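Technical appendix A lists one of the benchmark inputs used to test multi-chain prediction within the project. The record comprises three sequence entries:
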Amino acid sequence: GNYNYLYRLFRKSNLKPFERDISTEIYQAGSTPCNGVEGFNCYFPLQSYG
Amino acid sequence: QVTLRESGPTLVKPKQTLTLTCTFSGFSLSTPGGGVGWIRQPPGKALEWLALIYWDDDKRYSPSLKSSLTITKDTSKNQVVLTMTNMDPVDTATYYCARLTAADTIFDCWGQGTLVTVSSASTKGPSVFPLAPSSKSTSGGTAALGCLVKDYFPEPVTVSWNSGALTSGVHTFPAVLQSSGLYSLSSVVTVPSSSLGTQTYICNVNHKPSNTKVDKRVEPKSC
Amino acid sequence: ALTQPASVSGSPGLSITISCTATSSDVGAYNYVSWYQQHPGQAPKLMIYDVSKRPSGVSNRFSGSKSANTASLTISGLQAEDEADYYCSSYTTTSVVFGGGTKLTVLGQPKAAPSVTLFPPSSEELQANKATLVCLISDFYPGAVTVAWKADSSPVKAGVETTTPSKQSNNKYAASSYLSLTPEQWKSHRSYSCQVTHEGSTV
């Protein structure tokens, strides 16, 4: 598993044309915030290609 | 600013001539692009356009109802009258009085709509009877009072406690036609079992066809 | 007469698109199109009058876009206010079409247990030959569950096929029930069972 390169899957706002969006903060998924600890109803960005 | 409140009869015999009205205020029917129409919707399906009059005395009708729907205007008193014949048991719906301020905005603001049922039965009196907690009324703690009313054919009816004074937290949920042929509805206003004898509870029923403004106080009844 | 799908419901937070059909047979160019958000129990209210232009006052994130023949409402965040219907209306060649039905619910909500409370008739309708045993069933989000009667004799409807489809302020549908009884018989009967089967809490 080549886990070097990563991408972006979980987003809430479409980016603008020719815009560098380096997002690192914990994505608030599901319906309630979890503040870092993913657990349930959350997802961590920068997923792996595989 | 726009009060498209409908008024008129609610019960009609089969194969008759029905007449609906909706008094409006806050605007006029003389500005370019103005329009007042009628839109109905049977419970359980989509909506269908009936008619739409304009400011130039243009009476546009529905392609299917081309002869029954004869809508007229009255600018002197700001009232729109809708006439329809051949009352079949399919015309039961909530008729909304619409307002077309412009051509781009299709029916921006609506009214309230009245439910006109199509049947052959007459109207009946109310059955206002209080529901006080009894020895077998304690299940989980909820012992809310009620004045369930039944034995009445016209479905449109509302429950107003103290003429709209103690109506905070009312959960009066209406019902549908039963197997016998009489509607029924109760009040689920959130009142604990503690504050029941101190405050006065008079659910002023409002029957539109029968005009029965009966009142009944609610007190803790014994066995 | 254009149609539209029945359920395009999704999870809160995510974005969903109610894509109602075009049916270019009657419409000419799909110039003017409106969308309604009729709340259950009240009159329909407009949220967008043009294809993308929305009226003032009642507008948070409601937007629409028509590519070639049909538009679609785009709502992403405002998905926790009410599960109302969405009708798309457009001007036809001779009339005004209102589309079809689309019950957009909130997929995923707290599975709260239902509430069963017995309300025996007081001393007001027992002598009036109108004895009714009203049973209050509320405190459950998903639709209106079916009431079950097992009062030691037989399952009898007696006026239970109503489900009381009226949503409250807490967005919780209540399946309130009633019971048609004899003129005056209180001791000759027993406690009628109101064990309603709810999705998640069958008790």
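The beta strands of chain C are 16-18, 33-36, 46-48, 63-64, 73-75, 87-91, 96-97, 115-119, 134-138. The domain at 7-104 of chain C is CATH 2.60.40.10 (Immunoglobulin-like). Comparable benchmark entries are summarised in Table A2.
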